[PDB]
Design a protein around this nucleic acid. Structure first.
Lengths: 83, 114, 177, 65
RNA sequence: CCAGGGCUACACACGUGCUACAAUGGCGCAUACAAAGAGAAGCGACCUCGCGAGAGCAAGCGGACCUCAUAAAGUGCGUCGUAGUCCGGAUUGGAGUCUGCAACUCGACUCCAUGAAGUCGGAAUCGCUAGUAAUCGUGGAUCAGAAUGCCACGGUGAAUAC
RNA sequence: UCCUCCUAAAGAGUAACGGAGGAGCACGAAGGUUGGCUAAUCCUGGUCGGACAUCAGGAGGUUAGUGCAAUGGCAUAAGCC
């Protein structure tokens, strides 16, 4: 976890992107390479396509997802089973 | 000798007998008995019933056995229904805090039949 | 006893005032309470059933019956006429005593009692609830721990439907989550 | 009821911890002490207390400014 | 050249270590005895705040000066009275701190709660001839952060060799 | 050798190397008598408990049971205590 006196972490380009999507008011997805960014409350209800290494998996920001990083909802290593 | 969830032993000291409750350990039992004023040495059997009630309300202050089990199960179910990474690790029965999965994790993965 | 009198005044009055009842014999009265203890482990051991018998004789007032098997099932390794359970029927002042002790001094002690189910009405008003631990009753020493050995209690009512029986039970401030 | 097969059913006075007293007929053989009763239980009064069912956005506005 | 990922996966098998299964011990209180070494975008006293990790303010020190830094086993008193137990401390939840642009994948630590296997280990197999084996702590390099590894240093300290 | 059904043609009887099955016993209670009771199988509710154990209620009416093969019978029970 981060320190509490530092505040929550987000990229500047992601914050500009989500504020552009708020002033634009649309619900079209936006593809990001910013897995290390904490989900903010203004992002709720818009699908974000987070990079997992190959592709961009679209995750829908719910109310309960508002504490975690974006990359926590994008699995990087695929594994099904050894048989 | 009857704290609303369970029963406590009578021949243990009051700190160790208080730690039988789900939700208190060493430090919380020390703090509870420091608030209620009972010495840590004396057994439960020498205590009297008004003092057991003045213990009971301070144990009733904290979150203990029933709503603590509800809280823990609700948080783990919240993770598993969230779709996060720790949710999937709680799902498949694998270590969650980034432990070694290649060799060890024989607690979380279960006893080794195969 | 006391809850019988609380019935005869308040609950009879209430169930005249909320359902239209033409008569005072239209009200649901609660007929009996049966405490069944389906031990099932008597296919090999015998004294464990004779311990569950003393268990229901302690929890209830009177001595239980020992219920034998009605048909033989090869799936369960029981035979025709093996004493597989035990049961108590209590009615009258004894069910009113047991019902007052159940509603007041036992039902808080079910160890995270979050509120028992109100959908357990079978269809004709009879309610059935299953306790998992017999230590919730104050009759148990806890220096004589034998087994977990829970039971199921079935309140049988003379109500016709679910809602009349639930009115009769919740009139007694029955928990009902 | 039949005579000797049933256990003795004595009227005792159980005492709740919050201050209630309750005379019951029971077979424990002695007087008995309680902790929780029909009064002064966390379910029976109305203090049932479900937890926050998501305090996440409240956690974000409490943590960060 | 760059961003993100991976080298950290996990039905399984082996190698080498750490921690245990307790009473020659666990916990609480009081008190004694070391050696070696490092330190300048570094070591960081005293005082205050915080349960703690740490935070604030801040002298000294390129050092036999100052700091890291109270050595731990030991000892004296009490307590547990052989239980999976006041053993064990894995796993998991919540709340944090710090480094760092950044701690999800994937850091270390703190505090609260949780309390798993394990009651000395099969066939087999290893090290050790004296300040040694065993046991207890400390320090350093790499290092923004991240040792149960490696390299060193001292405390106590055997048994046996026909 | 004995028992039940069909062939067997609505009294009885009736053959075949015709079609199907059983017996060579059991029980001092499984006999006598008095008093009482009434099934199988589903649905729903309920601790372990689960399709199927025990409990409660409804459906249903003899689809059950008879110490043993089949037929006939059986509630006034010949069934169950």
């Amino acid at each position: 976890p981060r320190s509490l006196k530092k505040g929550p972490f987000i990229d500047l380009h992601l914050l500009k992107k989500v504020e552009k999507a708020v002033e634009s008011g649309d619900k079209k997805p936006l593809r990001t390479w910013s897995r290390r960014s904490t989900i903010f409350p203004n992002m709720i209800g818009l699908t974000i396509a987070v990079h997992n290494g190959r592709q961009h998996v679209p995750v829908f920001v719910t109310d309960e997802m508002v504490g975690h990083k974006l990359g926590e909802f994008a699995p990087t290593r695929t594994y099904r089973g050894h048989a | 000798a009857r704290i609303a969830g369970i029963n406590i032993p009578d021949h243990k000291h009051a700190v160790i007998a208080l730690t039988s409750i789900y939700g208190v350990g060493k430090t919380r039992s020390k703090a509870i008995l420091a608030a209620a004023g009972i010495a840590e040495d004396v057994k439960i059997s020498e205590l009297s019933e008004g003092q057991i009630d003045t213990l009971r309300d301070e144990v009733a202050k904290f979150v203990v056995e029933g709503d603590l089990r509800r809280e823990i199960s609700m948080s783990i179910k919240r993770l598993m229904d969230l779709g996060c990474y720790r949710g999937l690790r709680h799902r498949r029965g694998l270590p969650v805090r980034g432990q070694r999965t290649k060799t060890n994790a024989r607690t979380r993965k279960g006893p080794r039949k195969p | 006893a006391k809850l019988h009198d609380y019935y005869k005044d308040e609950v009879v009055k209430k169930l005249m005032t909320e359902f239209n009842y033409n008569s005072v014999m239209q009200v649901p009265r609660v007929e009996k309470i049966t405490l069944n203890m389906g031990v099932g482990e008597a296919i090999a051991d015998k004294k464990l059933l004779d311990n569950a018998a003393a268990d229901l004789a302690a929890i209830s007032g009177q001595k239980p019956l020992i219920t034998k098997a009605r048909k033989s099932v090869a799936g369960f390794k029981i035979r025709q006429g093996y004493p597989i359970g035990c049961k108590v029927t209590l009615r009258g002042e004894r069910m009113w005593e047991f019902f007052e002790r159940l509603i007041t001094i036992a039902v808080p002690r079910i160890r995270d009692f979050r509120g028992l189910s109100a959908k357990s009405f079978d269809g004709r008003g009879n309610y059935s609830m299953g306790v998992r631990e017999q230590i919730i009753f104050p009759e148990i020493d806890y220096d004589k721990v034998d087994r977990v050995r829970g039971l199921d209690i079935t309140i049988t009512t003379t109500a016709k439907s679910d809602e009349e029986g639930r009115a009769l039970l919740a009139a007694f401030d029955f928990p009902f989550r | 009821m039949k005579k000797d097969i049933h256990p003795k059913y004595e009227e005792i006075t159980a005492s709740c911890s919050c201050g209630n007293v309750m005379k019951i007929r029971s077979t424990v053989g002695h007087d008995l002490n309680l902790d929780v009763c029909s009064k002064c239980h966390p379910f029976f009064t109305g203090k049932q207390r479900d937890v926050a069912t998501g305090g996440r956005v409240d956690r974000f506005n409490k943590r960060f400014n």
